[PDB]
Design an enzyme around this catalytic site. Structure first.
Site, PDB file in Angstrom:
ATOM      1  N   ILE A  71       0.876  -1.309  -0.130  1.00 42.79           N
ATOM      2  CA  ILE A  71      -0.055   0.266   0.158  1.00 42.79           C
ATOM      3  C   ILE A  71       0.724   1.270  -0.004  1.00 42.79           C
ATOM      4  O   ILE A  71       1.637   1.304   0.777  1.00 42.79           O
ATOM      5  CB  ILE A  71      -0.871  -0.057   1.296  1.00 42.79           C
ATOM      6  CG1 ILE A  71      -2.077  -1.164   0.972  1.00 42.79           C
ATOM      7  CG2 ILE A  71      -1.492   1.291   1.380  1.00 42.79           C
ATOM      8  CD1 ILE A  71      -3.130  -1.385   2.163  1.00 42.79           C
ATOM      9  N   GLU A 160      -2.254  -8.891   2.559  1.00 43.32           N
ATOM     10  CA  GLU A 160      -1.925 -10.185   3.481  1.00 43.32           C
ATOM     11  C   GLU A 160      -2.926 -11.465   2.691  1.00 43.32           C
ATOM     12  O   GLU A 160      -2.453 -12.689   2.614  1.00 43.32           O
ATOM     13  CB  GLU A 160      -1.582 -10.174   4.721  1.00 43.32           C
ATOM     14  CG  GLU A 160      -0.600  -9.088   5.255  1.00 43.32           C
ATOM     15  CD  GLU A 160       0.932  -9.348   4.776  1.00 43.32           C
ATOM     16  OE1 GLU A 160       1.169 -10.135   3.805  1.00 43.32           O
ATOM     17  OE2 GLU A 160       1.906  -8.732   5.052  1.00 43.32           O
ATOM     18  N   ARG A 163      -2.348 -12.429  -0.757  1.00 41.76           N
ATOM     19  CA  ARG A 163      -1.164 -13.333  -0.849  1.00 41.76           C
ATOM     20  C   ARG A 163      -1.367 -14.611  -0.184  1.00 41.76           C
ATOM     21  O   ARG A 163      -0.608 -15.470  -0.557  1.00 41.76           O
ATOM     22  CB  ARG A 163      -0.201 -12.661  -0.059  1.00 41.76           C
ATOM     23  CG  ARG A 163       0.346 -11.187  -0.562  1.00 41.76           C
ATOM     24  CD  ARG A 163       1.430 -10.585   0.304  1.00 41.76           C
ATOM     25  NE  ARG A 163       1.912  -9.077  -0.014  1.00 41.76           N
ATOM     26  CZ  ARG A 163       2.400  -8.332   0.685  1.00 41.76           C
ATOM     27  NH1 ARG A 163       2.368  -8.676   1.763  1.00 41.76           N
ATOM     28  NH2 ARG A 163       3.019  -7.183   0.119  1.00 41.76           N
TER      29      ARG A 163
HETATM   30  C1  LIG Z   1       9.054  -3.466   3.265  1.00 39.61           C
HETATM   31  N1  LIG Z   1       7.882  -3.065   2.658  1.00 39.61           N
HETATM   32  C2  LIG Z   1       7.059  -4.182   2.812  1.00 39.61           C
HETATM   33  N2  LIG Z   1       5.905  -3.564   2.904  1.00 39.61           N
HETATM   34  C3  LIG Z   1       4.659  -4.216   2.871  1.00 39.61           C
HETATM   35  O1  LIG Z   1       3.885  -3.595   4.116  1.00 39.61           O
HETATM   36  C4  LIG Z   1       4.208  -4.513   5.099  1.00 39.61           C
HETATM   37  C5  LIG Z   1       5.761  -4.232   5.197  1.00 39.61           C
HETATM   38  O2  LIG Z   1       6.251  -4.066   6.490  1.00 39.61           O
HETATM   39  P1  LIG Z   1       7.424  -4.938   6.880  1.00 39.61           P
HETATM   40  O3  LIG Z   1       7.755  -4.779   8.155  1.00 39.61           O
HETATM   41  O4  LIG Z   1       8.479  -4.583   5.768  1.00 39.61           O
HETATM   42  O5  LIG Z   1       6.859  -6.463   6.246  1.00 39.61           O
HETATM   43  P2  LIG Z   1       7.491  -7.888   6.190  1.00 39.61           P
HETATM   44  O6  LIG Z   1       8.349  -8.048   7.439  1.00 39.61           O
HETATM   45  O7  LIG Z   1       6.220  -8.616   6.649  1.00 39.61           O
HETATM   46  O8  LIG Z   1       7.776  -7.992   4.893  1.00 39.61           O
HETATM   47  C6  LIG Z   1       4.035  -5.948   4.580  1.00 39.61           C
HETATM   48  O9  LIG Z   1       2.984  -6.164   3.948  1.00 39.61           O
HETATM   49  C7  LIG Z   1       5.025  -5.677   3.505  1.00 39.61           C
HETATM   50  O10 LIG Z   1       4.729  -6.442   2.366  1.00 39.61           O
HETATM   51  C8  LIG Z   1       5.975  -2.190   2.520  1.00 39.61           C
HETATM   52  N3  LIG Z   1       4.998  -1.208   2.533  1.00 39.61           N
HETATM   53  C9  LIG Z   1       5.346   0.140   1.996  1.00 39.61           C
HETATM   54  N4  LIG Z   1       4.268   0.981   1.902  1.00 39.61           N
HETATM   55  N5  LIG Z   1       6.654   0.349   1.877  1.00 39.61           N
HETATM   56  C10 LIG Z   1       7.577  -0.608   2.064  1.00 39.61           C
HETATM   57  O11 LIG Z   1       8.910  -0.172   1.602  1.00 39.61           O
HETATM   58  C11 LIG Z   1       7.140  -1.922   2.465  1.00 39.61           C
END
Ligand SMILES: C[n+]1cn([C@@H]2O[C@H](COP(=O)(O)OP(=O)(O)O)[C@@H](O)[C@H]2O)c2nc(N)[nH]c(=O)c21
Ligand SMILES: *[C@@H]1O[C@H](CO)[C@@H](O)[C@H](O)[C@H]1NC(C)=O
Length: 246
Positions: A71, A160, A163
């Protein structure tokens, strides 16, 4: 665009929305029968718009990167909000340009950052369709602390769920009563990048993961995922993040 109405929502209509969301993400390839998200998309086509309506019929539009289901920001009435991150700043060049004003939220979209803003880990935040109705309502008027919790709800109940079929099922179970996510739900969210990578690396490795992925299961037990015959791969995962984005 895809849309979802909380008014009159049930497990069925939610399932239709999650199906629509998945079907709106482009792919040229499947890997082990799972759609492979693109390495990149150019311009405005990179962003899917999700129109969400709370029970009262008020609406936000949420902009989602179609290459990774992140998002980026959302529009509420005449104000756009974007995460404080380069990818979202880039998105702001393409979506919600007609907003009268643009607010950059005081955190990135990262789970860790959102949880500190919100004041709680998502282990402690109930999710479900009622929680999603609240979240839309909250996002309608700027409050950055409240919005962090709302965004944690929104990300899990949309992205999620898209996914992982398991996460979609967890939300359907929570259609009329919220409940904190299962340990398994948290495990899958946290492993999506890993799983996506290992499923793609399996392609030239006889279905075998180069590195095992550790998950928590339905009974709350820690399991090793070592190959593409696992239920997580054959049944659960619905979208793969392209390794070019890992
Ligand atoms: C790392 N990244 C991951 N997300 C998504 O938003 C949440 C990300 O947070 P995260 O803590 O990086 O997720 P993860 O540890 O589960 O990969 C998860 O849904 C990621 O898929 C992200 N969402 C945004 N907006 N920007 C980002 O850089 C980003
Ligand atoms: C593949 O995974 C299954 C369980 O999902 C397991 O029985 C089997 O040992 C695994 N095979 C290899 C070679 O990793």
């Amino acid at each position: 665009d895809v849309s979802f109405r909380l008014s009159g929502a049930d497990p069925s209509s939610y399932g239709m929305f999650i199906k629509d969301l998945r079907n709106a993400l482009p792919h040229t390839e499947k890997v082990y029968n799972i759609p492979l998200l693109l390495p990149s998309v150019s311009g405005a086509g990179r962003y899917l718009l999700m129109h969400l309506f709370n029970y009262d019929g008020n609406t936000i539009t949420v902009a989602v990167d179609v290459t990774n289901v992140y998002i980026m920001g959302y529009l509420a009435l005449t104000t756009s909000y974007f995460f404080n991150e380069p990818a979202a700043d880039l998105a702001s060049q393409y979506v919600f340009r007609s907003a009268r004003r643009k607010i950059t939220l005081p955190y990135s979209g990262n789970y860790e950052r959102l949880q500190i803003a919100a004041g709680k880990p998502r282990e402690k935040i109930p999710i479900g369709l009622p929680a999603l109705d609240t979240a839309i309502s909250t996002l309608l008027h700027y409050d950055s602390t409240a919005a962090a919790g709302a965004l944690l709800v929104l990300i899990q109940t949309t992205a999620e769920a898209a996914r992982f079929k398991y996460i979609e099922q967890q939300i359907q179970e929570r259609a009329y009563r919220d409940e904190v996510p299962s340990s398994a739900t948290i495990s899958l969210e946290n492993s999506w990048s890993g799983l996506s990578k290992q499923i793609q690396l399996a392609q030239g490795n006889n279905g075998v993961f180069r590195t095992p992925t550790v998950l928590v299961d339905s009974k709350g037990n820690r399991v090793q995922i070592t190959n593409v015959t696992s239920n997580v791969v054959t049944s659960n995962i619905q979208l793969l993040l392209n390794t070019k984005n890992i």
